[PDB]
A paper describes a structure:
We found that the R260A/R261A/R262A triple mutation reduced the degradation and obtained diffraction-quality crystals. This construct of SH3BP5 (41–266; R260A/R261A/R262A) is hereafter referred to as SH3BP5-RA. In addition, the M167A mutation was introduced to improve the solubility of the selenomethionine (SeMet)-labeled SH3BP5-RA (SeMet SH3BP5-RA/M167A), which was used for phase determination by the single-wavelength anomalous diffraction method. The asymmetric units of the I41 and P41 crystals contain one and two SH3BP5 molecules, respectively. Although these five apo-SH3BP5 structures exhibit a similar V-shaped conformation, the superposition of these five apo-SH3BP5 structures using α1 as the reference shows some flexibility of the conformation. The hinge region of the V shape contains staggered hydrophobic interactions so as to maintain the V shape.
The Rab11 subfamily plays important roles in specific trafficking events such as exocytosis, endosomal recycling, and cytokinesis. SH3BP5 exhibits a V-shaped structure comprising two coiled coils.
Author numbering: 41 to 143, 151 to 260
Write the structure that this text describes.
């Protein structure tokens, strides 16, 4: 049973070598992340040190823009849902129209009865959908108005702050992806450790096997 434990321990040796490789890889990754983030720090600081008033005055505009976008998505959803509701009502009424024109009669009766049982909830959903639609559109356009009057008084600031924020954005998504890489890589490393450990457990199992033999 010697070649068995031999091959086993060789395989786990390859495994722990792999572990070492992934460890060094991870360390290198994080060390790469750090320099990038501090670069982002100093560039952000220097660009703020360029013109601070423009940026600080620009922020409310971006705030209003975000709010307006949220209201946009909400209003869009409300509109779509209302459309679906309208379609549902259309079909539900078309059914009863045909059924009434007909006046296998039992099947027709059951069908029109189920339909005319569903049209009530249909109408309720219609009302809900349309009122929600109106509200959403209202808040929507209100936010658009405030954003407009904000854009009227911030033409000089936001243009200056635009490159700062786009740079900040690029560095943000970059460091984000980097951190992602670090995370999943470390996870895979842990899994590898699990594998190596499992090979060791096999070693213990065989060690238990032989002395019993």
């Amino acid at each position: 049973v010697d070649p068995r434990i031999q091959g086993e321990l060789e395989k786990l040796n390859q495994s722990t070598d792999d572990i070492n490789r992934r460890e060094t890889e991870l360390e290198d990754a994080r060390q790469k992340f750090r320099s990038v983030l501090v670069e982002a720090t100093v560039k952000l600081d220097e660009l703020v040190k360029k013109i601070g008033k423009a940026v600080e005055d620009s922020k409310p505009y971006w705030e209003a823009r975000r709010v307006a976008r949220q209201a946009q998505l909400e209003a869009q959803k409300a509109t779509q849902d209302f459309q679906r509701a309208t379609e549902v009502l259309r079909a539900a009424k078309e059914t009863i129209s045909l059924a009434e024109q007909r006046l296998f009669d039992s099947a027709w009766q059951e069908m029109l009865n189920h339909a005319t049982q569903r049209v009530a909830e249909a109408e309720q959903t219609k009302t809900r959908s349309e009122l929600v639609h109106k509200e959403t559109a209202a808040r929507y356009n209100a936010a658009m108005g405030r954003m407009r009057q904000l854009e009227k008084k911030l033409k000089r600031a936001i243009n200056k702050s635009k490159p700062y924020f786009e740079l900040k954005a690029k560095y943000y998504v970059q460091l984000e992806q980097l951190k992602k890489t670090v995370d999943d890589l470390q996870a895979k490393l842990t899994l590898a450790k699990g594998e190596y450990k499992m090979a060791l457990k096999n070693l213990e199992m065989i060690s238990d096997e032989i002395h019993e033999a």
